[model samples]
Target: TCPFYKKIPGTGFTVDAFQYGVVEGCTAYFLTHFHSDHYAGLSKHFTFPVYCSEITGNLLKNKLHVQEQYIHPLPLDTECIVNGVKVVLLDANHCPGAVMILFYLPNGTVILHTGDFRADPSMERSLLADQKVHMLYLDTTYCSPEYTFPSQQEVIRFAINTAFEAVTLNPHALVVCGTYSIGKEKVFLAIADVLGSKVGMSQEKYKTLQCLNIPEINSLITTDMCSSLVHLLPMMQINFKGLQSHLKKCGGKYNQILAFRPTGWTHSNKFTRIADVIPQTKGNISIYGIPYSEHSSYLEMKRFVQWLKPQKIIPTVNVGTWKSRSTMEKYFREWKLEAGY
Candidate 1:
């Protein structure tokens, strides 16, 4: 996913990779968000200036310990031009700090790089009506028709309702929600508010999420583990073996555990309705892999391309492998045919 080997042909900007070291011709570096995949190569020895949103800037400074001098946090929907390239950062709707980067070349070629996003009506409203896009670097993570997962809002309702039901019936049911470094904040935040119980997480996550600037979330943060039944944990630690030991480690504070893996990959094209989706249960432990993806669904991606009709479509995700990229290209081919472009 880290396209370290390829730089956008004419642009001096390299996105999402610090691991590949500085490219000789590149003049600027653009970070899409704080996700490990995107911010792959960043570290203390990083030398280039990074242009990103304010929330991402905060994370880079606090989490990555990158100096403030090298970070440039640009305001959303603003245009900043330098060195013959005009850049505009638009709301990506993926994570808190994620953005879609638009570039206007000196010769008038307009390029759009959707650095991991969820296609919302707001974006269609704000962006689609205008633009003669020359090239579109798309997030092709879920480009097939098989991946039309439910909306984030629907997934949120399902998560909250499921947790609420479990907690309402069983007074001591422990609900653990799995999350990545920075996404799915809305999922756990809602669970905390609806359950009327403070959410517990690793001390480091608490510090990192403070960059979100949501003062109300502070009221839901619990320092001690025994205090809150709803806890947020890393995705890597939500497995059966992990949770079984976790239950014992908690010293029997709760009787049953309902853990959620709110992500897109868990979903199947076989089912569309939320009710039909099943959870894997091992006695007191249930792992529900909900269809809660931050990236745009298949239809969402289709509609975006149909509406915009960019002259050339480039798949960003799954591009390292030619087979995957071509499979994703099949969908783009279909969309373009329908759009008559």
Candidate 2:
């Protein structure tokens, strides 16, 4: 279930290459972020230098049990040299510890590997707008003209207020926000902060966040389920069966459980006139699927590709088949051409 696009051209530095075991000619390892998919191949036994963001590095050792000696955290938006190769780590704006890696090889080659990024206006400046890029490896998650979702700020703002309004109206209500331990923290964290309420999370995930060392987040987490009305659980727990068990475990302390399912699948296809994107449910156990995504939408990716105008664009996701790869490239070729000729 892993993609084979690991080794970056012109350098022994491998980004997320742990999926394929010891890479051929791989001088070092680099993780774009702490996303489980990106760091799938890592293990306690495999000893090698793995470069990544500071937060990611912390998770590498704390979560994955990787040794401290092999984990190297690179500073964001700062240039660092590795084996005489100039490299820079740019903020990917996707999730915690996520970054877009920029490599300047010895042969005057500049490559940007966007390891699961959400492209925005700020990147236009960080990527050097006028500067030409030799190659771009992007995670083409939603590469279609038919899809467009709202920006994260818009969804986060909506979710923050939506959650706040619910808890304020009824003191007995419990908002069980479904989320990954690492990503989409803003939705639940901000919601809890606004209400001045502590959040209920498992001790394990609560412990995991310790390595992240986010002061604002760690301060709000509690293992006692009854202490806080707002409970956060793993994404899988948001489902019907899992939610039922969670609701039962409460023992009538909370009247209702509003499971906040934040993900992109809720609002796929046309962004305009999204009817169900907004939160609306009529049940004791309501499920609110907020279109909260960590990846760029189709329009966002198009704008990014057109802006960068790289010579070659290699997709990381949704490129399994020959037909799929070609179909995805047509969009890239079209965007690159639209940028210039």
Candidate 3:
């Protein structure tokens, strides 16, 4: 083990969109996930060599559209000793390819970094019940009790029910739903499943779902697909203006359509403008309050803190900064937050 650890200045590290510090003597970095907060830095400019699970490495190179030359793959659960640090990657369950990391330092210090996660009872029982986590770096984006999330299945079911209900009242109504490309595909899948009808998917969406092993369920023809129960479709790759214009010109053939989109997007003004346009085309648009969020909710964040119990908790994603950034203060406060819930 190297006796000292220091940061390397300049070189691959840059000062633009992402700030990076080189861990000079550290061995490995158990990359938790490939989201912008974690992977975008590596994506923009190749910096620290990645040391993560095999599934994760592949997802970056393949799915997130990262360059292969930049990727350094490590098999899942396999402990690798880098600079005398043993790091293991565990499933985070937040995304298809997210992870939690357990860093075993040379001084018998175990640092558990719980990336973004959810409170799945089964996952909890399997992973947390019989583990000895020393220090935990928790994700506390929504540590406050006001945060809440509806189950993915429930959100999916609700969207389908809403779509089905819309069709009954306005037979000639058009519905538009927008969402993210990856996980939201499942939301449409659930909507289509419940509607028990064929769904329309764009070429890109089709390709996305093709990787998910369910392509036969997609309906190619627009009118034919829109006929039966609820018709599911993806938004155009373009933003609201382009989507509204293109879908508006598809003739008055299909009514009773529902457009879905994921929340927390940047084009707030564009969405507002497009929603206004929906009513002009004799189409109705409703944004469902589905809690299909990517971040951990209040209680889930707490449980994660309690389970991993890292010595230092660092929050790096967005907005709020780790509940005031006091490590000890956060631990006790979060403990109460989870206990109260």
Best by lDDT: 1
Which regions of candidate 2 are displaced past 4 Å?
Answer: 1-4, 266-283
Task: Check candidate 1 and list the clashing pairs.
Answer: 18-41, 19-41
| Reference-based lDDT, each prediction | 0.82, 0.80, 0.52
Per-model TM-score on C-alpha atoms: 0.92, 0.92, 0.67
Ranking by lDDT: 1, 2, 3
Per-residue alpha-carbon lDDT of candidate 3 for residues 1-341, written as tens digits (9 for 90 to 100): 11111111112211112224454443333466555555544553455456555556766665666566655665555666554455566666676556666666656656556676665555555434455655555565655555665556665666667767776676665555564544555665566565555555455544444443234644522345336434444444334454456456556566334556654323232234222323222333444434466667665666655664444444543423453656436555657466552
How many clashes in each candidate? 2, 0, 21
Poorest stretch of ten by lDDT in candidate 1: 1-10
lDDT of 2 at 87: 90
Task: List, residue by residue over 77-132, the lDDT tens digit for candidate 2.
Answer: 88899877989898898888899989888988888999998888789887456467
Off by over 4 Å in 1: 1-6
Candidate 3: where is the Cα deviation over 4 Å?
1-30, 43-48, 53-55, 63-70, 73-85, 167-175, 196-244, 264-283, 307-312, 317-323, 326-331, 334-341
